[PDB]
Scaffold this active site. Structure first.
Site, PDB file in Angstrom:
ATOM      1  N   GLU B  11      58.264 -16.465  52.295  1.00  0.00           N
ATOM      2  CA  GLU B  11      57.416 -17.314  52.237  1.00  0.00           C
ATOM      3  C   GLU B  11      58.333 -19.050  52.143  1.00  0.00           C
ATOM      4  O   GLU B  11      58.456 -19.465  52.128  1.00  0.00           O
ATOM      5  CB  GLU B  11      56.521 -17.498  51.286  1.00  0.00           C
ATOM      6  CG  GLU B  11      55.730 -18.579  51.287  1.00  0.00           C
ATOM      7  CD  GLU B  11      54.117 -18.250  50.416  1.00  0.00           C
ATOM      8  OE1 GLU B  11      53.759 -19.209  50.071  1.00  0.00           O
ATOM      9  OE2 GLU B  11      53.058 -17.457  51.091  1.00  0.00           O
ATOM     10  N   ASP B  20      53.356 -29.534  51.894  1.00  0.00           N
ATOM     11  CA  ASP B  20      53.277 -28.407  52.718  1.00  0.00           C
ATOM     12  C   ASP B  20      53.058 -29.784  54.358  1.00  0.00           C
ATOM     13  O   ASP B  20      53.139 -30.275  54.630  1.00  0.00           O
ATOM     14  CB  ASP B  20      52.375 -28.024  52.387  1.00  0.00           C
ATOM     15  CG  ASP B  20      51.053 -28.337  52.172  1.00  0.00           C
ATOM     16  OD1 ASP B  20      50.606 -29.647  52.628  1.00  0.00           O
ATOM     17  OD2 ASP B  20      50.247 -27.995  51.019  1.00  0.00           O
ATOM     18  N   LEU B  32      51.297 -25.446  45.150  1.00  0.00           N
ATOM     19  CA  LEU B  32      50.579 -26.300  44.573  1.00  0.00           C
ATOM     20  C   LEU B  32      50.656 -27.099  43.855  1.00  0.00           C
ATOM     21  O   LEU B  32      50.044 -26.964  42.475  1.00  0.00           O
ATOM     22  CB  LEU B  32      48.838 -26.199  45.974  1.00  0.00           C
ATOM     23  CG  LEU B  32      48.784 -27.630  45.888  1.00  0.00           C
ATOM     24  CD1 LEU B  32      49.116 -28.563  46.851  1.00  0.00           C
ATOM     25  CD2 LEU B  32      46.672 -27.296  45.798  1.00  0.00           C
ATOM     26  N   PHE B 104      48.676 -14.911  49.318  1.00  0.00           N
ATOM     27  CA  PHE B 104      49.575 -16.758  49.614  1.00  0.00           C
ATOM     28  C   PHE B 104      49.675 -16.962  51.220  1.00  0.00           C
ATOM     29  O   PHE B 104      49.884 -18.302  51.014  1.00  0.00           O
ATOM     30  CB  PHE B 104      51.004 -16.058  49.192  1.00  0.00           C
ATOM     31  CG  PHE B 104      50.943 -15.461  48.072  1.00  0.00           C
ATOM     32  CD1 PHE B 104      50.636 -15.207  46.876  1.00  0.00           C
ATOM     33  CD2 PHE B 104      52.145 -17.096  46.911  1.00  0.00           C
ATOM     34  CE1 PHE B 104      50.609 -14.776  45.904  1.00  0.00           C
ATOM     35  CE2 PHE B 104      52.326 -17.006  45.533  1.00  0.00           C
ATOM     36  CZ  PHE B 104      50.958 -16.020  44.738  1.00  0.00           C
ATOM     37  N   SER B 117      40.109  -3.053  59.058  1.00  0.00           N
ATOM     38  CA  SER B 117      42.057  -2.898  58.271  1.00  0.00           C
ATOM     39  C   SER B 117      41.601  -2.310  56.903  1.00  0.00           C
ATOM     40  O   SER B 117      42.642  -1.421  56.021  1.00  0.00           O
ATOM     41  CB  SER B 117      42.835  -4.162  57.986  1.00  0.00           C
ATOM     42  OG  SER B 117      43.258  -4.646  59.730  1.00  0.00           O
ATOM     43  N   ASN B 132      45.976  -0.848  63.589  1.00  0.00           N
ATOM     44  CA  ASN B 132      45.340  -2.144  63.436  1.00  0.00           C
ATOM     45  C   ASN B 132      45.576  -3.849  63.435  1.00  0.00           C
ATOM     46  O   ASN B 132      44.454  -4.573  64.153  1.00  0.00           O
ATOM     47  CB  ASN B 132      43.162  -1.917  62.848  1.00  0.00           C
ATOM     48  CG  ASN B 132      42.402  -2.138  62.879  1.00  0.00           C
ATOM     49  OD1 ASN B 132      42.335  -2.326  64.559  1.00  0.00           O
ATOM     50  ND2 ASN B 132      41.993  -3.452  61.870  1.00  0.00           N
TER      51      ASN B 132
END
Lengths: 164, 164
Positions: B11, B20, B32, B104, B117, B132
């Site tokens: 990230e 952002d 944030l 996230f 999944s 998958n």
């Protein structure tokens, strides 16, 4: 590790002549001796190949010798086959062993059927090839063997065989 | 290895307030600060959280502190969510970090969308889950990140992050 130990695990090694699931005389690692229903014919072919009057009983070293000739035949079969030659030439030695393992299970015609998987392997798209092979009828029919072969294609290592 | 280093790689970590892709003030690992267009509001929220007059500039340890609070929130979000709680409870700590990584990126709603999944992961069907997930729109949109997360689900190890 090596391809003999891989096929010994995946296919089995028998020291005494037996009949396969179509009734044909076989010994070693799925080594076909003859299509004749004569056990004597099967023994005569075996004696010629290993150079003893075996009476249908061999040692592991003799099984390995027959195995090594079967690998050489399998590779010649592959090199002759326009569908298999390009992927085979592109693969590292460990991944070639995985491809030969499939040729041992299902024959060249069987393996040439996996057009998309073989192209993915040629392209070195290992994860995608492995996922694609896991969706096959082959995988559903013989999942223990297919998983190990597919791990071999995925990783280019012998890790699937570590504990076997 | 640990989840902070994983999300720092996947990230990013910024030490100075930025906006952002929706224009909202953010710092650290996608932390944030406020939905207000006021940079002052963003700074006041940041100052409260770390306990300094920061003027919108923090250290890595302060980013890690904000990160640790975001992980605690993400886990509370997961535990509150009937779709995510059962898989989360079932996973080992490394695979939980993979699930939190997805939270996230895409939020709880995003992650709850992967019904098949998540059931595969619950069932410990690691290879199948990984294949998958590799077919997803998520994977196509952010393939570097998704591949690493998927390797984490597949293996339960931090191997994807070894060289990063």
């Amino acid at each position: 590790m090596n391809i003999f130990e891989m096929l010994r695990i995946d296919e089995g090694l028998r020291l005494k002549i037996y009949k396969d699931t179509e009734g044909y005389y076989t010994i070693g690692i799925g080594h076909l001796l003859t299509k004749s229903p004569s056990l004597n014919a099967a023994k005569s072919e075996l004696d010629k190949a290993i150079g003893r009057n075996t009476n249908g009983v061999i040692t592991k070293d003799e099984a390995e010798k027959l195995f090594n000739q079967d690998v050489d035949a399998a590779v010649r079969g592959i090199l002759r086959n326009a569908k298999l030659k390009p992927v085979y030439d592109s693969l590292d030695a460990v991944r070639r062993a995985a491809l030969i393992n499939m040729v041992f299970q299902m024959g060249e015609t069987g393996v040439a059927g996996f057009t998309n998987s073989l192209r993915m392997l040629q392209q070195k798209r290992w994860d995608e090839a492995a996922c694609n092979l896991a969706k096959s009828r082959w995988y559903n029919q013989t999942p223990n063997r297919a998983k190990r072969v597919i791990t071999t294609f995925r990783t280019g290592t012998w890790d699937a065989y570590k504990n076997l």
